Each structure stands twice: as structure tokens, then as C-alpha cells.
Design a protein around this nucleic acid. Structure first.
Ligand SMILES: [Ca+2]
Ligand SMILES: [Ca+2]
Length: 258
DNA sequence: CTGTTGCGCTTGG
DNA sequence: CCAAGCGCAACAG
């Protein structure tokens, strides 16, 4: 299953097991965490799949100063663990200056990465995580390191897409006719008898993507920003103790009972 | 209103 | 195992 379905399967599990007190926030909605417990003591729960990514922050390479700078447009403030990572990379600047989509892993200890994740998700009022290994496993944020192995890398991650708008349809129609294919466009609703799902066309300093949602096709404009962010990757540990899973399951049942 | 940018998400190969 | 970006919201121009 995908992550969208996985978040639903978690909250449908929580609602059936503990009552209808778990609201899911928007999918791809990033302003807050996934699941909101609407009890007397309300808190958030974050659903991760066994192989997930776990937060990021962009660093701008100051090639003139040979140091790395925190992007002022980041959405989380610098914590002592952010400055630790930045201090390492700027000590090894030239080895990290060659930005790449493949990225360079950061060989600092895993404890520092756990701490950054702990502080990032505490700022989001996350009290517990939920994930499955065949059955659902739930634990509070303070026991994170006992469930996930954390790697950290510095890689380019191209920014996301936007809807095609009124201004850029002329460039998109011109790029589609140069491709030589059926179509008819009513407004921005694109119709065609040929399957053009996930087709990518280019032109006029813009790359477009075509997707079907409601029987017809709509168009996305791909980004042009290619910045580099420190980003974390987590993997669920295979053999986990059972004294720990029950101890943190009861901490969860005690938290939704306040 | 347009377009950058950062953050969500594993996903694709 | 290794490489890599689109779907979102916030925000300056
Ligand atoms: Ca989320
Ligand atoms: Ca999540």
C-alpha cells in the first residue's frame, strides 16, 4: 500500500480500537502532523511507514565564506542539533559543496539525528508515533531511538509542482501541438482519447505533467528550484523487545484516558 | 495573482 | 540496495 492509504489504515485502526476520537488532517497537508486525538487531553500522532523520511532543513552553501548557512525561509528554528550538523558540514565544506541529487551521507552519530527528530516533532505537539511491522506499533516520541534506525543525508530535492494557470496555457498548448497528438481543452480541463497519463512535455522554460483525476486530464507545472536540504531517513528495527512495546502501549492507553 | 521555496510523502529503479 | 522528485501550503514580488 501507499502512504496515503497507510495513514488511513492507522486512523481506522485507532478509531475502531479506542473509539471515534482520531481525526486525520489533510493528505500532503504539511502545516501540522497527521492524526489528532480529540480527547480530553488533545495531542497529535504522526504515522510513518517502516521506510520513511523524517524531516529536513535547507542549507545554502556560502561558497565565498566556505560555510553553510541556514535558509531563512525554513519552517523550523535552529536547535543545538541543527548547529551541530551545520558545524560538521562547514568543517568539511568542500566535500559537501558538490551538491548532487544522489547526495552525501553525513557520518555523525545516530543519537544527534534522534535528538533533532525528537525536537522537531515535539514542536508539532506529537506525543506518539504509529507504524506497522505486520501489526500496529505505537510509542511515545521519547522512545523513538528504540524503534527506528536513522540515517541523515544532504541532497538536492527539487521543489514541488503547481497547477497550470491562465497565463501559461499558451506555452503549454504550443508545447502540446509540437508533440503532435489529439486533444481538446475546455478551460484548463484537458480531454483526449489517447492515454496520456503521467506524460511530460517541455518548452518555454517550463516542464509540464499530465494526470487524470475525474475521467479527464489536468496539467501540472513542474518546479525549477533545485536546492539542497539535510533530510533524515528512518527504518524500522527488525527484532524489537516486547517489554518495550507493551510498556509504551500502556503509556498510550494512559494518555488517551486523561 | 505568479511563481519560489520549503516541507509532506517514500518511491522508483 | 541505491537515487531522486511531485502534491501541498506559506509568502514575497
Ligand atoms: Ca504529515
Ligand atoms: Ca506521517
Amino acid at each position: 500500500m501507499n502512504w496515503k492509504e497507510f495513514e488511513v489504515f492507522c486512523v481506522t485502526y485507532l478509531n475502531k480500537t479506542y473509539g471515534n476520537k482520531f481525526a486525520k488532517k489533510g493528505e500532503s497537508d504539511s502545516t501540522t502532523s497527521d492524526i489528532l486525538f480529540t480527547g480530553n487531553n488533545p495531542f497529535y500522532i504522526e504515522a510513518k511507514m517502516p521506510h520513511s523520511q523524517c524531516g529536513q532543513f535547507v542549507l545554502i552553501p556560502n561558497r565565498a565564506e566556505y560555510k553553510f548557512d541556514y535558509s531563512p525561509k525554513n519552517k523550523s528554528e535552529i536547535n543545538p542539533y541543527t548547529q551541530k550538523i551545520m558545524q560538521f558540514m562547514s568543517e568539511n565544506f568542500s566535500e559537501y559543496a558538490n551538491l548532487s541529487t544522489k547526495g552525501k551521507i553525513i557520518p555523525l552519530p545516530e543519537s544527534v539525528f534522534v535528538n533533532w527528530i525528537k525536537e522537531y516533532y515535539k514542536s508539532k505537539s506529537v506525543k506518539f508515533f504509529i507504524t506497522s511491522n505486520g501489526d500496529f506499533i505505537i510509542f511515545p516520541i521519547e522512545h523513538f531511538e528504540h524503534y527506528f534506525n536513522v540515517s541523515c543525508t544532504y541532497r538536492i530535492k527539487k521543489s514541488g509542482s503547481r497547477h497550470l494557470n491562465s497565463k501559461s496555457l499558451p506555452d503549454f498548448k504550443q508545447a502540446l501541438d509540437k508533440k503532435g497528438i489529439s486533444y481538446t481543452m475546455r478551460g484548463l480541463e484537458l480531454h483526449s482519447d489517447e492515454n496520456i497519463h503521467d506524460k511530460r512535455i517541455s518548452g518555454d522554460d517550463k516542464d509540464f505533467l499530465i494526470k487524470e483525476n475525474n475521467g479527464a486530464y489536468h496539467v501540472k507545472i513542474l518546479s525549477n528550484t533545485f536546492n539542497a536540504n539535510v533530510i533524515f531517513s528512518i527504518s524500522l528495527k527488525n527484532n524489537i523487545s516486547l517489554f518495550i512495546l507493551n510498556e509504551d502501549r500502556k503509556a498510550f492507553e494512559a494518555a488517551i484516558s486523561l
